[PDB]
């Protein structure tokens, strides 16, 4: 076509969609990760992983108001992998890697994945 | 704005 | 912080929230815009514009599933405006200038106005 | 992946 396109579009609707989760604005799921809660936008989420991809495209589960994930799943690193969906900044640290990459293989976030296995490999 |  | 960011993100992010529009998965409203509809998902028109920001943060309005534009709103510059909201382009023309600036002050989308006033101001 |  013969489009124009706004450089800053993309990440100025981002921000936006981050603001409306922080207001806790227009949140119409509960995200359960052991005694924690997290509230976000299914949109966002599945935009962002295969997981919920595939939970809010599924008949049923598409309804729910409310989602549990596996016990096994890490609190803290299902926290900065939902910060990473809304702003596209990964709170990476030695401290945390081992579970964001688990939280992250478990979501299908497939670029949170690479850059683990390569930070890992490079302190080995 | 940018011819993308 | 000490953060990583993924260049590509935010980009991805609208690219999925546009396949979701096109497939019609999770949209939450109708635009009524004359004779024709428009669904949509409310956080991302919210992002988009001023005006749908203030219409899905009003206490009543937020729970509506059908939206009337004001009859003097054109159907297919608010069609172009919708496509941008999803994909940062923008298909202005000639024959379609007009009606898109009038529905991007309306909707209260500055970056649009703005390009469509430089580019009228270059044809004077 | 860049630092911002
Ligand atoms: O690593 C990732 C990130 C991700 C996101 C989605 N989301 C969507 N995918 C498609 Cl094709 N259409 C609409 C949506 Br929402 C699917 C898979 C994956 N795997
Ligand atoms: O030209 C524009 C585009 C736009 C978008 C929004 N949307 C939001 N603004 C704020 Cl501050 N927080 C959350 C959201 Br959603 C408000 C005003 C405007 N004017
Ligand atoms: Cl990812
Ligand atoms: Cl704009």
Known sequence: DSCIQFTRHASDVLLNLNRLRSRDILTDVVIVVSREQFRAHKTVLMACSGLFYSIFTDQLKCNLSVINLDPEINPEGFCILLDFMYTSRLNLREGNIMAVMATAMYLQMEHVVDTCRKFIKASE | ?4
Chains 1, 3 share one sequence.
Not at chain 2, 1 to 4: A, G, K, Y
């Open chain 2, 1 to 4: 704005w940018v011819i993308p």
